[PDB]
């Protein structure tokens, strides 16, 4: 007999997360994957999030999609949901004053790529259809590295892009950026860490580091914080240990997994995978685009790996 999540609660005596607890775009099942093998797009760079290059559809499954950087090695391929912010439309980067890189080898042109590729861009209607109040291009506020999460930074916006923004950390290396929204738990106004108490990270190579000032810093570039009106974080998520859920696995990402919330914090939640060690457990924010409901592989038509059996 098939798998099921009936049985398994039944065996198990536990619940599933209910589906209130996950954001709207985690829980859509209903939704026509329309994407297509050697359609192709535009995207961010998942390594690089400030940089939008040519990709190249190489794997549909259920709602998801494996995204291929034209030109470049398979080692760089990626999975993304269908309903994804983080792909665009051919052309999307000219209408709206973005700089594309170009695929490996390349004076660009998409029609003339679409020719010399014999291919066709994914169609505007495959993709989901308000700016981010009080957060523009060039203006600062202080970040957590969520690379080093102790750190809180000195950050700039440098790119907005429907609802969300880019996050900045000034002079360090651009693989640090980060997308996010208004209401986001890793970000602060201007003068947070002093009103904290906590230690704040100036720009790579600061002279007299210490010595740091935003006054004089914000004077040196011209710049403005972002308001504090702006920022307006979201509430605790409502996950309780033990709840099950699906989650993609980390070390294969083309796999879903049956899941259990194994800990929690405010805004993140701890996932085991069941009957696998707990040396593969990981922490991940709450409303991370790779965890769903019970259900949304079913519903979605993506295979989901039961839990390992003992």
Same mark, same amino acid.
């Given at each position: 007999?098939?798998?099921?999540?009936?049985?398994?609660?039944?065996?198990?005596?536990?619940?599933?997360?209910?589906?209130?607890?996950?954001?709207?775009?985690?829980?859509?099942?209903?939704? +026509?994957?329309?994407?297509?093998?050697?359609?192709?797009?535009?995207?961010?760079?998942?390594?690089?999030?400030?940089?939008? @290059?040519?990709?190249?559809?190489?794997?549909?499954?259920?709602?998801?999609?494996?995204?291929?950087?034209?030109?470049?090695?398979?080692?760089?391929?990626?999975?993304?949901? *269908?309903?994804?912010?983080?792909?665009?439309? *051919?052309?999307?980067?000219?209408?709206?004053?973005?700089?594309?890189?170009?695929? +490996?080898?390349?004076?660009?042109?998409?029609?003339?790529?679409?020719?010399?590729?014999?291919?066709?861009?994914?169609? +505007?209607?495959? @993709?989901?259809?308000?700016?981010?109040?009080?957060?523009?291009?060039?203006? +600062?506020?202080?970040?957590?590295?969520?690379?080093?999460?102790?750190?809180?930074?000195?950050?700039?916006?440098?790119?907005?892009?429907?609802?969300?923004?880019?996050?900045? $950390?000034?002079?360090?290396?651009?693989?640090?950026?980060?997308?996010?929204? #208004?209401?986001?738990?890793?970000?602060?106004?201007?003068?947070?860490?002093?009103?904290?108490?906590?230690?704040?990270?100036?720009?790579?190579?600061?002279?007299?580091?210490?010595?740091?000032?935003?006054?004089?810093?914000?004077?040196?570039?011209?710049?403005?914080?972002?308001?504090?009106?702006?920022?307006?974080?979201?509430?605790?998520?409502? $996950?309780?240990?033990?709840?099950?859920?699906?989650?993609?696995?980390?070390?294969? #990402? *083309?796999?879903?997994?049956?899941?259990?919330?194994?800990?929690?914090?405010?805004?993140?939640?701890?996932?085991?995978?069941?009957?696998?060690?707990?040396?593969?457990?990981?922490?991940?924010?709450?409303?991370?685009?790779?965890?769903? #409901?019970?259900?949304?592989?079913?519903?979605?038509?993506?295979?989901?790996?039961? #839990?390992?059996?003992?």
């Amino acid at each position: 007999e098939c798998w099921s999540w009936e049985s398994y609660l039944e065996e198990q005596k536990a619940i599933t997360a209910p589906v209130s607890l996950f954001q709207d775009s985690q829980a859509v099942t209903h939704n +026509k994957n329309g994407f297509k093998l050697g359609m192709k797009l535009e995207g961010i760079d998942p390594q690089h999030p400030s940089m939008y @290059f040519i990709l190249t559809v190489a794997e549909v499954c259920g709602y998801r999609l494996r995204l291929h950087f034209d030109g470049y090695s398979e080692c760089h391929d990626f999975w993304v949901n *269908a309903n994804s912010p983080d792909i665009h439309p *051919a052309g999307w980067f000219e209408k709206t004053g973005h700089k594309l890189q170009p695929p +490996k080898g390349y004076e660009f042109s998409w029609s003339q790529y679409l020719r010399s590729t014999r291919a066709q861009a994914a169609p +505007k209607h495959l @993709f989901v259809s308000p700016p981010p109040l009080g957060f523009q291009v060039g203006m +600062k506020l202080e970040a957590v590295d969520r690379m080093n999460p102790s750190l809180v930074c000195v950050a700039s916006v440098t790119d907005v892009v429907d609802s969300r923004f880019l996050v900045h $950390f000034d002079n360090w290396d651009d693989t640090y950026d980060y997308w996010c929204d #208004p209401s986001s738990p890793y970000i602060h106004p201007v003068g947070w860490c002093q009103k904290q108490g906590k230690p704040l990270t100036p720009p790579q190579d600061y002279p007299d580091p210490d010595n740091f000032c935003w006054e004089k810093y914000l004077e040196e570039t011209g710049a403005s914080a972002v308001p504090t009106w702006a920022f307006k974080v979201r509430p605790p998520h409502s $996950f309780l240990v033990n709840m099950k859920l699906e989650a993609v696995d980390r070390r294969n #990402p *083309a796999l879903i997994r049956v899941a259990s919330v194994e800990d929690v914090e405010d805004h993140r939640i701890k996932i085991h995978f069941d009957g696998w060690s707990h040396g593969y457990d990981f922490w991940i924010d709450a409303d991370h685009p790779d965890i769903h #409901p019970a259900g949304w592989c079913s519903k979605t038509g993506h295979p989901l790996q039961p #839990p390992l059996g003992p």
